[model samples]
Each structure stands twice: as structure tokens, then as C-alpha cells.
Target: SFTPLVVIELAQDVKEETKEWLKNRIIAKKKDGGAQLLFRPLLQNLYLVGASKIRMLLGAEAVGLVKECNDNTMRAFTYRTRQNFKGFDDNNDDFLTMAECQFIIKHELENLRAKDEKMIPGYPQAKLYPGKSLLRRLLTSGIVIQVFPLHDSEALKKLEDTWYLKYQPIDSIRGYFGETIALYFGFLEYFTFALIPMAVIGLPYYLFVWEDYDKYVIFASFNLIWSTVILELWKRGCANMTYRWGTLLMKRKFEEPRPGFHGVLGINSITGKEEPLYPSYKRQLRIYLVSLPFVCLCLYFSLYVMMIYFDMEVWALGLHENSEWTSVLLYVPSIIYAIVIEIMNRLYRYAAEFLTSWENHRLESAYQNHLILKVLVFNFLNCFASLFYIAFVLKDMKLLRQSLATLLITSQILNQIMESFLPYWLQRKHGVRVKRKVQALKDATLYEQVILEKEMGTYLGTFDDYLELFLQFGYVSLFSCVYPLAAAFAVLNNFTEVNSDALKMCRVFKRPFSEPSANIGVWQLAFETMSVISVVTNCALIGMSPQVNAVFPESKADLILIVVAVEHALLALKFILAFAIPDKPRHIQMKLARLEFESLEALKQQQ
Candidate 1:
């Protein structure tokens, strides 16, 4: 049996007290009727027990699964355990015996050490198995390792039923999948309830307001308020989901250091154990002063590329108006812009990864947040900047209208095709042809075949999911005015997106290592930032309109006042919505309180 070092070294006299203390912190209760330890949650609790005091009492053997080091201090890497130990606690005692611990450690270690097909099940034989979907084969053969058994089953079932992955207790579904699902479904709800229905109003409003500046102002103001309400409601929905899934209470400080970070070796004061000592404050400063500027520079370069496209658009417009044959050349700018942005995206992403790695962030969260910041900043500028310039600076209403229309339709259509259909087709074709090649190879073992299959799954990633959602939000909120059907188009795209992304995740991607997360991380912040910007952008569009100029009668004062006032009101409404929606729902808080009170009473009764 594998006894943890802390458990082995604990003083016999205080062991009972330590045991009782651990029992008191118990989160998941094993039921009498075929219930288990809720292994993932149990592992989650154990992962957090990395404090030296806890280690001295519990030992390294038990805490080894989650113990982490930062600045010579041992801490719990209390995220999700990287290993899936679904049936390790088979006895359902809600405790891991020494033998069970040994089994888990040995199993995980064996899994890590294996290089070939033995580590991942269901390859050569299962692939040829008749009448089963690849997903079913993978699950049945344990090729897709889900950490929580019943919860994984439930999530799978929900996704089967609704195409929206179920939000589970304590993130039974992995963070990557959960975040994707949350964004997809949240957008689905937004489309169905808010945007789609609002299309009715926008259609009639556009008809009535057609080229009439005063009437358009009324429609624009209505959109401003509608957008604000939708943003607020979506935020609340995200919070509610977070609360339901037990991530509302998760703190950022608990996550492990980023994989790219390195530090000096030192001894911890509490445990007297040697560990890596990172200069936290110095790294923080370096990220802000050094990494940030590099990120900004790369992003600025991408924006510059987009501006060049805008210049091309100016030329294209002139050519179209002047020459009959050159009118066809108007399409050239849009195609050129799309290609430039795609190429620049690859360049910007490469820079972001390098800079974030160079920054040597202490926490994975910090690294991811910094990377997301750069991407979102670049995306906002590339997607919306030219339109913004036309609406505000050029004050070319015709150009602005055309540009917004081009962007809203072209970008969404291109992204949907590239992200969903193209990859699926290519991967499907590759998979069908790869099997014959594998069979013909002389040296290929079953394990080798499995490894090849697994490698194929790594192509799709989370970047596409986030970027698509961001662009969709931009389409509906930023330029829905140019084409009143912008929201309608977005709603349509999202419907296809939900199923297409699901298929990619289930069939086309490698099974991701599961990690627990509370919310959509920094994406919430990105959306909120966009919402605020949308208010300003939409208001500016209204301000630049002919009627607004007519009503002001050559004085810019009233127009400026209205735009500024409306912007402030929207900002205030955003803040108010955030305040009104509690991070944890009332029911969640009440349930937690009840559980805590009951546990305390039980402890007192035992005393």
C-alpha cells in the first residue's frame, strides 16, 4: 500500500484530531444506494490540502497528486486532478485507503509511462467495429477518459438531448468543454430570446426610419437600450450557471503556475523541502512593462494591416464609380482584407504565445488572461475599427453603411465555413485514408496505430470557439444598424455553430485533459468591454446620421451632448447590472449555509 509521507510521519497522538478535522471538511457524501465517493470532487478537496500544516498532518503521499510549489512555498494546485480515477474508490467509504491510494498512484504512473496504444484504448479493433459512432466506441473503450463517471454520463446525455453540454456539479465536464458549451448555449439563449425577437422591432424600425435621421435616432436609441439589457441578462445567466456548477466560490490564487514558467531552487520555510522560488513581484512588473508593449506592438501591426485594407477600399470605391470594368474590382478589397486578417491572426497568435511564455507568468490564469487580452484587442480593432473610422471621422454615411454591411455578412460567413465545415471535411477524409496506410505499414503495432489516431484529434482547439463568439457579438451589437438583419444572421450562424462545434469537439478533437473552472474566465471581461464599446459605437453611428445633423442645425453641441449622455447611461446600466446580479445565486448561498450549519451541529454533537 502506498502510504503518503505526511501520513507516515504524523504523530500518533494528534492523528485522531487530524482525521476528525478532515472529516469535517467533507464535501461530497456517499449515498447508501449505489453511490460512490464522487471521486473527482474528493480528489478536488485533496488537491487543496497542500499547506505545510496539512502536509505535516496528512503526508506527501496523499497530497502528491496536487501539491505545488511557488516562491519556496508549497501550495495546493487545487484545480482538477489531471488523472481520471473514476473507479479507484470502489468501496465508496468516501475515503481513500492506503491500498486505494497505492492503486491510484500506480495506475496513473503506469498511464504516464506508457508510450503507445496501451495507454489509450479502442484503436485498431474498435475503429473497425461495425455500426457504432466514433464517440460511442471511444467512450465504451475508455479512449475518452472522463474523470467523473455519473456526471460525465449526465453531461453526455444532456448534450445528446439538446446539443448543449450540461453544466454539472463542480465542473464534472472539463473546463475546455464547459467553457465552449457555456458560450454556445448562452449565445443560443441570447439569439432565441433577445436578438431574434428584437429582429421584428429592428425590421419595422428600419422601414419607418429609412434614411430619416430623426426617426433613425429613435430606432438607434431603442437598440442602445436593447443591447444594454441583453448584455446584462447574458452576464446574469453566466453567473447563474457558475453558481450552479460550484465555481462561483473558486478563487484565482488557488490555480497552479503556468507550464512555461521557470524559477530558482530554494527550501520552503514551513516544510523545509526544496522547491522552485519565482520572483512574483519582479515577474509581475516585467509582464506589465515588457510583455504588454510587445503584445500591443504586434496588435498595432495587425490593426495597421486592416487600415491598409481600408485604404484599398477607398481606391476600390473610386474605381467602381469611375470605370465599368473596374466596378468588379470593388470585391477585391473585401477578399484582400479577409486574407490579410487571417494571415495576421496567425502572426499575432505566434507573437502572443512567445511573449506570454517570455513573461513567465506565475499562474496559468494570468498567462491565459494576458493572451486573451492581446487577441481580443487585436480582434476588436481588426473587426470594427475601419467602420468606426468611417462612422465618426470620415462621416461618409454611404461608405459607413456599405462597410458595415460587408463586414457583418462576409466575416461571419467566412468564419463559419472555415471553423466548422472545412476542418470537418478535411479530417473526415484524412481519417478514412489513414487506416489503410496504417494497415500496410510493416512496423506499426496496435499501439502505434492508436497514437496516430490520437495525434489526428489534436488539430481543433479552443481559439476558434472564443473568436467566433466574439465576432458574433460584434456583428449584432456593433453594426446591426447597417443591415437590420445582422442579428437575424447571427442567430442563424449560432444555431449551426452549436451543433458543428459539438461534432468537432466530440469527433474531431483529442479528448482534452479535464480542469475545473467557475466561469468563462477573462471572456466575461472581454464581452463586457465589447458591450461598453458597442454603446459608444452605435451612438456614434446615430450621431453621424443626416437627421441628427439636421436637428442640431449646424451646431455640434447637442449631438455631442446626446452621444456622451447616452454613453454614460449605458455605462451606468452595465455597472448596475453587474451589481444587481450576485455571483452566487440566492439558492446556492442558502444551500451552502444550510450544509455548513448542519456540519457544525454534527461536529458539536460528536464533541
Candidate 2:
């Protein structure tokens, strides 16, 4: 094998008769739009697949994917087969990026369709249809365990050294992991640096004993502007990155059904292919009613538990009242509640996924959007309900400060500990056994290496990373009006995120395949959605502050009236700024326009 782009983990338990078919199916020739796949037996039953460079290029010719050429225009790809090419790579081996190669192989393998087979051999219950994907059925049956790109040892080591030592080889990550993963780091880096201004401006206020809501009002104003400004800027920066990566104008696969989606087989409206069709309205209807109940139930439960925490805190206060010695233990309730809330976050994660899956969205984009919607709401309440209670409901600025500290820091510490350390600990034991096995081989074959990598945890997606960042962003935008200092800790957590996320990619998990995303996907929308809410939260925080009421001690309604007007104007201003700022910066726009103009001129010349 020239270079192993991807590993296909075939089942550890399978029939000898069926293995032959599976192997031959994968190792089929490129002339037939398939690969001469690299095979290595990990065990008697376990098999491995390597999508090789020779095969990759061979397949590339047959596949003929559109690729960027010397004229910086995307043209149909060609290779050395007969050398019939212009404005495209004639014989370049590295013309396709590593990510491109991996995806190309992945595409070919996925398109290994069934022909004249009504059922898979030796799997009696498994159904197969002509032209349906071969590997898809096997994947569903757990015959194919997993598929992911292999780590480039030197490329990963490059990230570990430079990326760990406080520099981002972000473009390198794009080349290796592809655009989606790369853009996430790009955003994380952008977000961390964005907070530096917020951190500096507020650090003095929080530290210098400026203990007044009037002081917070200024930070609230800054917070509002900062949240909106950074979000919009990232869009521009993101557009810039993807334009450079050439994923910007690449059209997405228009529509496709998710794997879990089930319905009666019927013809597609446009494609005219028979696919499972469930009425979109029915899914919407079932979910519409179910959505309200489950969402409210989660919120009710969250607040109900929060109420219990308050009770416990009151009891702790009583205990302190009963004895001076017990005063040392006064912080007990908040700490316990923080962990309990963090526990719900863990639990809600599962619930959100299950709920979305039950909703049974047909498209991947819909499924993800609904999942993020559920996740954002439930998580927002769970993570921030306690802080919200102390801030506005109880009007205890004293408790608000400490509660902010407890919730944000507890979740942060617990997340890093659980996310990084526990996986590492499990991998520690897993690593021990692997080393012993490797020591026997001494100079083990790369096939042996695939088994160890497969043993590592699977890196799921940007969903987990962005979800946590969304929560952190909420804390920064919503509650930071009270504890402006906590935004500083957010910067810290994000900085920790880069290395640890890298650690997971390099060590804790299997190397992920490039998704080839153009932008940060729905997260940009989700983050901006929070930024919109921050205006309300921050404004309400200002009005609900003690000094605010004291200023109009007699005319409480007048104070609220004024607050509402301010909030409206603030929201109006935020929207205006968001629109005023273009998603792509001018330089990138110039490049974009230039490409289009050149293509238009080429079209005219042809005429």
C-alpha cells in the first residue's frame, strides 16, 4: 500500500464463506469503479481495508471528481490514463489532498452497490436490494464496525509540537482533518482571542472593588457589542478560511436521507429514485406536540431540582445559625448543586439525541438542526437555571456571583477531567495491552498498527465541541454581566480545549475523516441565536440589579418601562450591526469576484 488513507474495520466475528465475498467486493478493480483495496488480517475474523495511493489515483480517474486546476478554476479531474487533460493535473500524484483522497476512497467504498443480490450471504435476516450500498447494510448489521481516516504520524506530531506550544497550524489541520474540523479550531482560536478584550476591560472592574450594577451596566453594554461583533467577524473570517480552502462555493449534496430514517419505499420527487418516504408533515406533527411536553418536562425537572438546592442551602444556613463551627461548611450546597447540574448536562446529552432520533428527521441537516435546538434549550436551562434564579428571581447579587463561579468552574473542571482524563485512564489500560502485543512483533506491520488505533475511542464530531462552546458562550454573554471576571476563565477553558481536542484527535480517538464543510455549519446560527438572547438577559440583569430599583424606589413600573425601551433599541442596534457587517471580508470578496469574472470572460471567449 502506497499510503493508507482510511481503515475499514470488518467484523471480528463473521463466517469464512461470507468473508471471501466481502474481501473480493472491496478488492475489486478500479476499471470497474472500485479499488484494489489493501487487506491485512488483524485476527482470524477481523479484517482491515487500506485505500491506497495507486488505487486512489486509479479510482480518481474513473471517479473524475472536479478539482482546482492551475488556472485556479475547478475542472473535471484527470490523471495519467491517456493524458487527455487541459487546465487539470496531467500526472501529479499529490494533486488530491490527503483529506480529498480519504473522502474519494470513502465515496468509492460507499458506492460499492449491490447487483443481482437479494440478500447478503450468511446473514439470513439482512435485506439487500440491487444498487443499494453494500457497506451500508454491513454497517447497519455491525459487520463493518467503523471507518475512519488513519493519522499521518508526522503531520500529527507536527500539530502536537507546534499546536500544543501555543501556536495553531490550523491550515495543517485543514489539510489533514479537512475543513470542518479545521474551521472549528479556527473559530475556537478566534473566540479565545476575541475574549481577550472583554477579559481585560472587566478584570479591573471585578478586581478593583467596583461593586455596583452601574459598573456592570458598562460591561453589559460591552458584552452585548462583543457577542454580536465577534460572531459576525468569525463569519467573515470563516468565509475567508473556506475560500482559501476552496470549499466556499462547492455546492452541498442537495438532499439525502439519514441512515436511521424509515418509511415506505417510494420515488423521490426530483431524483426519481425509490427511497423510503415518510410524510414530512407527520413527523412535524408528532414532534410538535411531543416537543412541548418533553421540553417543559425537562425544564420543570431542572427547576424542581434547583428548588431543592435552594432548600438545602437554607438548611445549611440554618446549620450555620445553630453553630458557629458549622459556618465552615456553608459552601456545601452550591458545590453539590453545581455537580448535580453538570450531571444533568451529561444526562440531557443522551436525552437530546434520543429525542431527535425519535423525531425521525429524513435529512441529516434537519436531524442535526433539531438536535442542536433541543440541546441548546435543555442545556441552557440546566446549566444556567441556578445562576438565573439568584440573579433575577431572588435579587441576591451576593449569591449570583458565587453561583456563577460554582456552575461555570465546576462544569469546566469536570468536563476536562471526564472528557480528557477518564478517556486517558481507560486508554492507559488499553495502551498497556497494545504495547505488550507490539513488543512481541518489535517492528510491527502497519496492519497491526490499525488494530491499536481502532481500539481507541471514536471521535464523533464537532457537535460535542461546539455544544460545550455554546454553553461557555452563554455564560459569557448572559451571566458575565454579574461576574465579568468569569469570561476570563472562558478564554482559559477554550485554550485548554484546543490542546485537549488535539489530544483526543491524535491519541484518544481514531483519526476522523474530513467532512469538507464550507463553514461552521449550524453552530454559527446557534451562537448568534445566543447572542440575540444575551441582549435580553443582560438588559434584564441591569433592570433587576438593586441600584436600578433604588433609583426609582417609588416608580417601579417606570424603571421597567425604561428598561424595555433600552432593550428594544439595543436589539435593534445588534441586528443593524449584524447586517452592516458582511459575512466575507473585502479581500476575500475580491478574490471571489475575480474567480467568477475570469470564468465569465472564459465563457464569452468560447462564444
* Best-fitting candidate, scored by lDDT: 2
- Estimated TM-score for each candidate: 0.67, 0.86
Judge candidate 1 at residue 39 and give its lDDT.
Answer: 15
| Candidate 1 global CA lDDT score | 0.53
Root mean square deviation (Cα) for candidate 1: 13.8
Clashing pairs in 2: none
For 19-62, candidate 1 gives per-residue lDDT tens digits of 34223322222121111111111110121111222222232232
Worst 10 residues of 1 by lDDT: 35-44
Clashing pairs in 1: 4-61, 5-61, 6-59, 6-60, 7-59, 117-447, 213-547
Q: Compared to the true structure, candidate 2 yields what TM-score?
A: 0.86
Model 2 — which ten-residue stretch has the worst lDDT?
A: 81-90
Which ranges in model 2 have alpha carbons more than 4 Å from their true place? 29-44, 52-67, 74-92, 112-116, 129-133, 165-167, 212-214, 255-279, 286-293, 315-347, 358-365, 408-411, 425-429, 440-443, 590-607
